[model samples]
Target: HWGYGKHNGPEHWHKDFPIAKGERQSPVDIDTHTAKYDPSLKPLSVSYDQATSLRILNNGHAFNVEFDDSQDKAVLKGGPLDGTYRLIQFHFHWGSLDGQGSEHTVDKKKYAAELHLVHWNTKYGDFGKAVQQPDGLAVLGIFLKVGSAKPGLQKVVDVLDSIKTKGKSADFTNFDPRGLLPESLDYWTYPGSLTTPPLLECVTWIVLKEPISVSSEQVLKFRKLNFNGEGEPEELMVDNWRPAQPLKNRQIKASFK
Candidate 1:
């Protein structure tokens, strides 16, 4: 289990997963000044069926909202993709204690947190099979800011107490993730990999420009969840965001100037 600590962390990931040093890695800094804005870029098409949201699991890595991806319940189209992608699950990454935990920064500026809506390209197959190919996955990234409490978000935060330890889980449903998204779909597009291991270069990244709000009280509740299982020595599951990766020879396209 790799963590964000000084020991078995991102720096040591390459030893096990060779793709850690791969060309198209994730969590790169977005430089708006040099980013190419394309007028012809298509608007991101998203359709999420709230009923498909089934369960919540504390997998010791991150809190995962598992969805029933059996059918095209929730899918993403257009944007930088050539095919439809099915929503599988969505999770989040945030700081251990303060306002600096976003993985992909803009102009090297870190945000409070980041949400990853993970979807697999239906053209490929299941997530396990699809991940090996180039157009295997599509992740919609939304930035989070600390401020007033968001009603929709409180539903998610309320469940934090139930699933406090590793492997803890509970039924979660009828929760539409769209409510957490911003009004403007304006975004930046790029090719990247899973921020976690088996670090496959398989995602078409669509990062939104506008951010959503989470109250200071809600932000404090996020870290109360534990990384270790019950009976194991306690450890806080904070600072799970990965550092920015090298963009190397890739180009990022903006949907608007």
Candidate 2:
């Protein structure tokens, strides 16, 4: 049977499959003292108008936006590196319950949830096949915490009613994801793998130190989601996050002065 509880969570996922013990994972705690500060690092510029043309796909696991070459509009101009990276997809990791949402941990402290903004280098040709190549993917990690209701997240929260069931998705129109970004772009950088399986270790992770806030009620609603297959009625799919993994001597870098 598909398990969904403590011990059975992603932390102990290797228990089910011994091979996972050697896989690279994400959501490592980023401590300044443990990380080498890089002053040269900067924020990437993204054009929302150009990004709108990207195709969005809800893969039952999360919402993934595929960058279309036709637009070629969204570009990352500044930062420590100067290059054009296309906006790929955006998705979230959350807990089984509202009170304990968050995929990554720091010193054993967990946040409400995490959002991943995936991007790819234009030189790779397209995001579809770029993810397999090293240095092809750049993911921005944003933490989400439970708090007083904010108008900023209503757009995402409002869609729960439509995508309440797992594997269910609807086309989102006139939506600019830039509104969801936290004001403070200050971040921690590191080389890490995807939080999920097949844990490829090619991602350049930029995790924002500042977290965004959403209503407690919204979190509760988020916990109501389930992994039910398409056409299946919505069932409680709370706690879809993976547990923290070993750092394995990996070095994390911070942009904070």
Candidate 3:
């Protein structure tokens, strides 16, 4: 199995997943100067109903919060997307320390962490099938800077104790994800793939320019979780992030002037 360890990390992934060297691989560094402004891009439309939230779990990779995507209760539209995309699950990638963790960088700048709101194209039937298509997914990326505490984020942080080990889960219902989002919707869009293994090149990455705030205390709490499962070596789940990949021939488009 692949992991963010010294031997099984990003650089070693290309050996198993050949597409890792594909032209549209993801989490590319966003060079703002090179990003062209597209007037046609509309402001992002995100409607996340609290009732959609189901449970939060430590997936051995990153902590993920799943939602009941049976209906369009939590859906994303507009911006770089052509139609409504259903919100599936959301997760985070972080560093061992506060200095760096984010997957996508702006002008080579790294934030404390990164949030990925995964969505699937309804036209593709379901997520399993969507992952195989070119225009089947839209992921909204939000940067988390070390600063003020966010109550919205605290709800998830508060439950970390229960899921301290990999493959563990706790009820995390009626939580509105909007609280985790920044005020401005301005973002940079690009064609990319999933940062993790299999690295399917299907995601339309819409990364917000502005970052949200989270206290250092909250980040420290995340580090307490274990990367190794219940009875393994008990490794800390830190630096669970894939480094920024090569941009290749792709061009990033900005939704603002």
Candidate 4:
């Protein structure tokens, strides 16, 4: 049941799990030009740090990273984002090849890939509890594009050798996720829902304008991570990204005034 093959992928998740359709989906294309620019929605500031307990898990659908919130910190101290949020999970959305990967699009143009830095409100105890809160989650989306052939994701890819096969996960030590964040923290914010199931309508979406670069070969390596469970090797996991959902009357705001 926790597998994501073609017939049972996220696109069809709603079929098997009706609640899937209600989940807050993300990576929706953000058009800077047409999106209503609201000065009150700009992010106050962005911060970074070294993360702890960075673990790569083969969740039978794709490779996901779950780490402690100690690595980096981002505070939206003013405007519509006047609160302290902690980073929880950092995962990615990728296409099969160079031509298509990104989760959110801008005016129908899809980038090579997308990364999500999921965060939650400390007022709600922890991420687990905050995720259930209507206004408890704040996700930062970073776009990725294929660039020069160099290993920028060594911290991540370095551990892949240990998790080469599906359903395999290893505990990584001294890994700092800050190296993974895009250089620029300038982003766009909007009120949206989670990109996963239960589709809770309580997430504040902050997507960065500048995209980080990942080599084409590295992209392929990430694709190798799968969602197959124990004793299930027949499943070939590929394309873990979810399809773009409707904006549903949601208005996106940019950080730049």
Candidate 5:
């Protein structure tokens, strides 16, 4: 029942989900100056099997492209991770306008949108189990800037018209998510929670420093999606991103100097 509307937005979430004010909440402002370079951090490793890609769905809050997580065919390792994290699904958060939309900001600067690659640690057996542990989830936050169009992203965009309403989904297969990543794997890592409710404090956030490019037209395609389902009052899904949360006492470690 929680949403990004003015009445049930992020500020009012704590009333329903008490953990919204937890210590290690996510989508923090990445103050680069305050991030310390840690030599101990290893280079991030990511490998995805094109077959792992499955369905794409409009979950009302955001559209998600889910994957088959039965095995470790597609996974992320290293860079502050103690074990392999299997790719489950990836989603986006965007604004109605090009000015601001991303969840995490760098030096108080907001991006047009953000991409979250959601993964769960295999050590925990399943995503449901992993989600309850402190190191259960690892979400890679990739910023999206408005510029030249990305061909890879176009593949997903083309399917948006079919799943335009909430709870709608279509079969999408063999789609390689790697094409959406930036050239640089350098990122900032910190302990945090899910940006949305139930706001579990189990995620190890890895936010990439470099942003991927997307044309203004492509972003507009995303806004065309509806938050309400078919036969309901049409509400365009926009500004579905949570504002920056407090950093608390946690330190952000940078993989690059």
Candidate 6:
């Protein structure tokens, strides 16, 4: 029943989800100077089979494109990871305006939007149980800036009309989540919790440095989404992002200088 509404916004989440204020929370502002280069961090290795992509659903939070992680159809490894993480689902967060949206920021600067590719450690096998353990989840964050339209994202945009209302979904396949990634694999890594509650402190954050491009038209489709079902007073699904949390004693380790 929790939502990003004015009545139950991120600022008021702690009253219910006490762990919302827990240490090592996610969506922290990444200051380049504060991030240290870790030569030991391995280059990320991604192997995804587009066939595993099943359906897309508007979970009231965001439209998620899920995968069949029953086997290792797609997985992420390396980059401070002790084991392989299986791709489960991916979603986006954005604001109504251009200069807002993204969950994580750099030096307090916001971006047009953000994409989260959620993966769970194979050791745990199930995403439900994985969130309860350390290093249980690995969420790859790719920033989106207003620029040239992304060819890979066009398909997703085309389908927004169908899933504009919350709980709507359609058969989505042949789309590879890796297409959303940037040219540079350079990223900042740290221990953090899910930006959303039950705010489990079990994720290994891998935020990429480079951002991909999306046009204004594509972004317009994102704003068309509603927080409620068809006919409900339109509270556009935009601005569904959480604010950055404190970095505390955790050090941000980078894969590249």
Candidate with maximal lDDT: 5
Candidate 1 least-lDDT 10 residues: 42-51
Ranking by lDDT: 5, 3, 6, 1, 4, 2
TM-score of 5: 0.99
lDDT of 3 by residue, 111-162 (tens): 9999999999999889999999999999999999999998899999999999
Write candidate 1's Cα lDDT for 47-161 as tens digits: 8754389999999878998899888888999978888899988999999755697999999988888999999988776888888888899999998888877787888999999
Residues 1-257, candidate 4: write the lDDT tens digits: 53345665677767655645554556576777877667666445555444464688765555567767743444333435656777666777777777777768877777777888777777777877886777788777878888864344767866765665566888865656667767677777777776655556668887888888888778777776545545666544555666677666677777675
Candidate 2 vs. true structure, TM-score = 0.84
lDDT of 6 by residue, 47-128 (tens): 7754388888988888999998888788899989988999999999998899999999987899989999999999996999
Compare the candidates by TM-score and give the number of the best one: 5
Estimate the lDDT of model 2.
0.67
Candidate 4, residue 57: Cα displacement in angstroms equals: 1.8
Q: C-alpha displacement of 241 in model 1, angstroms?
A: 0.9
Cα-based lDDT at residue 151, candidate 4: 49
Model 5: CA > 4 A from native: none
Error of 5 at 210 (Å): 0.6
Give per-residue CA lDDT, model 5, range 1-257, as digits (tens).
89999899999999999899888898999999989999999879988754388899999999999999997788999999998999999999999999899999999999999999999999999999998899999999999999999989999999999999999999999899988999999999999999989999999999999999999989999999999999999999999999999999999999998
Prediction RMSDs, each to the true structure? 1.1, 3.1, 0.9, 2.8, 0.8, 1.1
Per model, state how many residue pairs clash.
1, 7, 0, 12, 0, 0
Error of 3 at 36 (Å): 0.7
State which candidate, 2 or 6, has the greater lDDT: 6
State the RMSD for candidate 3.
Answer: 0.9
- Model 6 pairs whose backbones collide: none
Lowest lDDT 10-residue stretch of candidate 4: 70-79
RMSD of 6: 1.1
Candidate 4 stretches with Cα past 4 Å from truth are 2-4, 16-24, 70-80, 149-152
TM-score of each: 0.97, 0.84, 0.98, 0.86, 0.99, 0.97
